[PDB]
Amino acid sequence: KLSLNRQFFDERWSKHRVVSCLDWSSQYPELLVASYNNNEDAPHEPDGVALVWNMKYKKTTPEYVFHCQSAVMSATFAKFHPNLVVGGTYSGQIVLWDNRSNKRTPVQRTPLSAAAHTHPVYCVNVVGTQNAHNLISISTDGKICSWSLDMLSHPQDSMELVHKQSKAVAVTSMSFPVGDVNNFVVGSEEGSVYTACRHGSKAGISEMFEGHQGPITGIHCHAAVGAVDFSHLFVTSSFDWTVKLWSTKNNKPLYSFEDNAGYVYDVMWSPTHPALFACVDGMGRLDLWNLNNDTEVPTASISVEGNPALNRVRWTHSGREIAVGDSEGQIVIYDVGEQIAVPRNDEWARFGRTLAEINANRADAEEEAAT
Amino acid sequence: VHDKELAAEDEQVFLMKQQSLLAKQ
Amino acid sequence: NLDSVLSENQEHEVELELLREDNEQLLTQYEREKALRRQAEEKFIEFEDALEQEKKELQIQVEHYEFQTRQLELKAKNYADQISRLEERESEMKKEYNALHQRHTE
Amino acid sequence: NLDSVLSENQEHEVELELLREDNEQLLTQYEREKALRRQAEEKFIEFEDALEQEKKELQIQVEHYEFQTRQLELKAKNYADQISRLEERESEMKKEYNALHQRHTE
Amino acid sequence: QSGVNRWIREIQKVTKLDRDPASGTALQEISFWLNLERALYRIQEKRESPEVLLTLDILKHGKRFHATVSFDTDTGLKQALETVNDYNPLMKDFPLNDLLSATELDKIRQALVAIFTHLRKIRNTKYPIQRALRLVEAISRDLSSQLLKVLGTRKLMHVAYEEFEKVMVACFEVFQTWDDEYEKLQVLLRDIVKRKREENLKMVWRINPAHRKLQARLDQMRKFRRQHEQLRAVIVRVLRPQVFDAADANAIEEVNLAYENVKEVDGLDVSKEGTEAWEAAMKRYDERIDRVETRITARLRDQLGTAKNANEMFRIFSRFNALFVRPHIRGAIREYQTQLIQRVKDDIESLHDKFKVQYPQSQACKMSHVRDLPPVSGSIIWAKQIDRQLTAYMKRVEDVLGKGWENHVEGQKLKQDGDSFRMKLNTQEIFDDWARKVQQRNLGVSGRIFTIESTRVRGRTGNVLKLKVNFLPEIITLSKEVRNLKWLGFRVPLAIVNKAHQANQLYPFAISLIESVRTYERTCEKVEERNTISLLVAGLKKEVQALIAEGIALVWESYKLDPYVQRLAETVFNFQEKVDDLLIIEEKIDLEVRSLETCMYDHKTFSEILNRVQKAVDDLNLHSYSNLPIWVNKLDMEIERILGVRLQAGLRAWTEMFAWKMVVLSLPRIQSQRYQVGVHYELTEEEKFYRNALTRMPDGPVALEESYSAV
Amino acid sequence: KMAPSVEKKIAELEMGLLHLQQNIEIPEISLPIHPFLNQLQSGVNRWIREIQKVTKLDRDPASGTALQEISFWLNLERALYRIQEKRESPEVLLTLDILKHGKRFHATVSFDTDTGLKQALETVNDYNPLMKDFPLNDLLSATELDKIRQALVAIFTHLRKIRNTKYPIQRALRLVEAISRDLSSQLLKVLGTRKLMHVAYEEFEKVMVACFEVFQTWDDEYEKLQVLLRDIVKRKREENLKMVWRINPAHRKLQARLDQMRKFRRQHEQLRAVIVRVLRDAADANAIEEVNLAYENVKEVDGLDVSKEGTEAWEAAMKRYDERIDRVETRITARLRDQLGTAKNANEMFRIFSRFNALFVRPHIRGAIREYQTQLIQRVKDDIESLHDKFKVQYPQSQACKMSHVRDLPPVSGSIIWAKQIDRQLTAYMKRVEDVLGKGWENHVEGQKLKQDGDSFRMKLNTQEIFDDWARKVQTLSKEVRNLKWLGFRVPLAIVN
């Protein structure tokens, strides 16, 4: 069952704004960073607001407030620095807020040069270990830069992503596999998912996936690791009212969940349940798809009050409370039941049998309908 | 000895002069 | 007249430094534009090669399809002439059968 | 000390004129290279759009030929059925005509 | 004469020899024609021996004419010789010997093309068309026998499905090869007939090939096994118990035993007994299958009782996807057709209600603007997605109701509704309206980079004139729309693409100039908020305005635009962080000054507060703010006045004199420019300590006299 | 200059005899004659058959060297002139005349038209402006890279006479591909002589920039030739119905292999110089022999082979080198992490951070030592605040003024010595910060505030105005004169005397 747990809405900052990104801290799993876009009704107010809310405390105020000059498009936590909030804004700067400083103004920012990003940055991440971690960012012109978290003045590595006839893929979202620093996947607004490799002899776009018929909003790789490896799988959510499930082997969509209503704005694999993923749609409905239970209807659906358009969803690292941001800035926390969240000990083998049954039935139906 | 202060000009007349510089050249 | 020569010397120094920096900037940017034009010509020649082979494949499919259309339409008009003659012949000896049937009837 | 400062003035003058005309040469080289690169991009974009347009025309012709071949093949199949049916009917009426000559026989 | 008549009979029993073409195989006819031609040539060379002509010359010398006329006219030698030499070029080589030893179906096909290409030599011969037709029938009989032997050896019945399917696929392509090669041969004999109208009076063919009925049998076998396979698919699919009845296991065993009992019956027997065995087997199979067919239909009814929405009914109708052609579930679809049409009509009306709200009034435009999509391309994607969902609904309805759902009244009004929605959902008019607007407006960037423009801001009567960068937002949106619409298959004109490429190559300087101008305006607004510190940042504002006045003369196509943009961005960032640090440290200075009134009267806390203020002023001096000593003097008068008021309070609290007086009077003064060293000037007591607090006495020195009168 | 030139002429004689050996040759036919009309018909039919045998000669240009093509066209030209001069002999004209007298018009017509001598001779005469005096012998005879460069520019300036002939442009492109083929072969021969793996880095870099200059010369001469080919194609539109412009030269793979080899060798030299500098225990010797073993493991693989097995061997050797270098890097990270087991005071830790600074170019070594740098930067921030507090008091209020008064130092020069000592301590602290944060400390998170504070502090440490004020007021003095000339101030001439 799905139930409301907590509602976050700040009166001064998060009013008349649409949530743009959500993240939970890896070290401190009760902390949510929530990006925001510009309120057009208040030009004197800062364009980009990044709030940090707390789960343990029962107050309604944001625990930290940051704001940049330009509209913040994607802000995450630093995975190996506990004090930094790294945001990527509309102008292409990568601002780096600090919490120990007395200022809400960023303490570090990248230049707007040709050696750095220039178009809006919609995907930033921190990859690596303690001894070797980097910040990866891709703009919407397809430029990918790998920075170090100290020297944000020029990138350590940088390239332009091009697949065919040196045409620039316009990257909208980016995901990384579990335990991988080299390979990653990108979803463009041209409708095409591309896999890619960071460094090596072949650096850049590796393959191509045809798939969708609209801009791709959110792509997430598989997170839960158990008896059977599933890191080659990922899910995508796009503008054509579908959620498409893929693997890196097959060049075709393995399944196309048509959310017959409104668009689909974000999707995300659960980090504990290996067969569960959540998606949001455009009329406020949040759906959970458990593939071991049923692959045609949502397992559990909820609707936020007033039905606003939902932008982003994000699971906690415990897989128990998910966070969803809407068009009014109202961060809502939804607590899933233990019958849906906690997996059984045979759930990886059951998902392997379910994936084999999906593959066999769909391929057999296709080859028996075509011939 | 005490030196008198330097001050940047008022912004309105400054970029009004720069508007004249833009239009004349 | 030492002060005038000193003023001339410092003015010449500031002009020298200014247009030396202008020289270095112009050289670097000219190298940049040459490299970018080389990149553009490389894009032109590769895209040339690739889609020219694609165009030749599609043209091959085009006049193959034209050959198929021509032979099928020729078979169709041969069929047209033969059924026209067949129905004409069947109708005339049907009339002959009717006349001979009335001959047997009377 | 007019000798040394006038020597500095003289060296400043000759180096300023020399690398000033060198600067004018690089500025001319810059303007030529910028014009060349701009014309290369314009030619590339024209070639893009014209050749992609004629590609789309070839795709339209391929689809039209496919549809024409399908409908003409359908015409040939059902019309061959017409040939077989009318041939069977005229065979039957030939048989009844032979029965009528049999009726004349006895 | 008697031996002449003996020779006449001996060659008349051979020249009249003829073989019926309907009887026997083709190879028997080939061997007969070859042997007859060879024997006729043998008796021809024996006829032309000189001793025979010697006997005819002797009989001519004996006036026995009748034997000579018999040997000249009644022989029939010349006509039979012309017959066997007219049929010779067709009969010389013939390819059925390769067919008789062929074992694989492609070898059968290549023997077929060899035979039918060898049959093309009839056009130069006087072969009768009816004998050619009987020869083709004999070829078909030999084909039927050979491929029956091949199919009997391969044993297609008891073996698995896929390779059995592919060997009948190869057999049916062999039958197609026979069909079109017979078509080519038939038009060849037609064109042969068109040259001999008065000779042959037998127009119709009426050929019945022997293999054809077997082909029909194989065709029946094809669909039969196909049906069985499809049935077995759903019988392992839907028959699972939804969370174990004997009905589902009875269905699995009924299908298995029905297929076994039809597997016992041989299907390759083309005879009448084989035909009636085939018919009895299919009647038994239909009787065994109809029970589980009725069970499947009843479970479809019970499954449709609990199904409410259109997508649910489509998802459960596609579970029985392989049984749409069996003529019992079609009645169940016909009974439930009206509910499907009504509910699909409701879904179409729901999509029409979505599209009824316009694009700028909807949330899709807002969420596309959030995710960086320009509004015309977002509207195009919106209309294309509604059209795609309409096409998906029509495709699903057509696929479930069969082709030919148009003729009903509900079907024709549903098609009318879909047609109206599709012509309301066109996307081309929006595209060339946008193209006409952009081509009329005729955008493009050139000239100098900055622009002064005077606007009327509310709250101010005077027209406030502002500075912007010469780069319209419509340039950036036009570049985004060109990059979006070139993806979408829409042809955009040349000037728009060239303008977009110039904009994309000039964008990184323009966005940095826009950010620097906005940062400078925000920092100047923050400075104008606090008028008290305007003289501290006079040097930085002077430097930034000097840089703006330097760069206002630059053109967009200049070569100096690359380092100037970086220099301006660095200077404006430094100016902004200096102003923010000045704001923080001036708030600290004001807090420490306002806390001097509430600080209790002692030397140590006054010295600590003055040390903190001196440290803040020292940090002001380290970053070298402009006009520091004037602002320090203006602060020094205020803190001296505060110390005078506190001296009044301390003196009237007393009403050992100098011990109480040296608490305030020995406090060190604030030094503005103290980082300078080398100048050996020593400040006196009045400019090092607050010795002029009696000059800043708020009530005048009369209270000092009140301190002197008590002693 | 005698014996190397003699050796080059000897190699030129050997190369000349090599293509005289391997020259594809045309069989020289001979027209026989009678030592009656039907015998002449058979003889002239043998003539027509052998002339059609010679004149139908053609060669696929996609195979073989370019010198084979040049020699083939030259030999065809010579053979066609020999056939033309043999056909115009008086005896051949005589037997053709008496065949014309015999009214055997078939022989005369078939010897007039069906021989195909006219159009073949016209075609080879049209081609012969390009085929003469071709300079590819200079390419196959050169061993120095500048010689290869001038041979390449001579070949590409010979190629500009396409405008005279009616050569097929596709055949010209395959000729260019053959030029690329034997250019790659000669470059492989020269670099195999040069033994690039066995040489030091400086000569390796000289031959790499020379070979890439050769590649660059090929590049722009190819763009000029391609411009001329586009000019000659758009001017002759009716001649060629179909036209493709694709070409894959055979030297680009060798260029990419050389680029990858040079980019490997630069990284290996950069690591090995640092390792042999600063790692002079068993761990140091272990690391240097592992580095030498990795270099020898790559070195034993013949990198000049461009084939598929050579490519796989190069990738295997580079993968083994990368894994060995990663093992050496982890070993030296574990060696550097033993600092707190030895360094307790920050001063000797500063010293071993200065001695071992050259490992911090690598990203793993820089990212591993992270929590140390915050403490070190905090220590230098404390020392910078202490240096500010030493400048909190001024020189007249300092004890250094009394120490300068006692030890016979004038107060102005004592102030200048005091300020220069403060500046020296500030520069030492900035050198320490640069050592701690490595190269590029000026754009770090913590080093930026340090750099800004050091710059604004050095702006207030200038001593020009004190010297100027002293020189203005003075216009004990000899003490100023002989102290201020040590400090680099240009004293006035009137004050020295």
Numbering used by the authors:
A (entry chain h): 238 to 608
B (entry chain j): 349 to 373
C (entry chain C), D (entry chain B): 65 to 170
E (entry chain f): 246 to 488, 512 to 923, 985 to 1040
F (entry chain m): 177 to 211, 241 to 485, 513 to 707, 745 to 766
The authors write:
Cytoplasmic dynein is a microtubule motor vital for cellular organization and division. It functions as a ~4 MDa complex containing its cofactor dynactin and a cargo-specific coiled-coil adaptor. The formation of dynein-dynactin-adaptor (DDA) complexes is a key regulatory step in dynein activation. Here, we determine the cryo-electron microscopy structure of dynein-dynactin on microtubules with LIS1 and the lysosomal adaptor JIP3.
Distance constraints make it likely that one DLIChelix comes from dynein-A and the other from dynein-B. The LZI coiled coil is sandwiched between the dynein-A2 and B1 tails. Within the LZI, residues Gln89 and Gln93 interact with dynein-A2 via residue Tyr827. However, the Gln93 of JIP3 sits on the opposite side of dynein Tyr827 compared to the equivalent Gln150 in BICDR1. Furthermore, the downstream acidic patch is spaced differently with respect to the glutamine residue in these two adaptors.
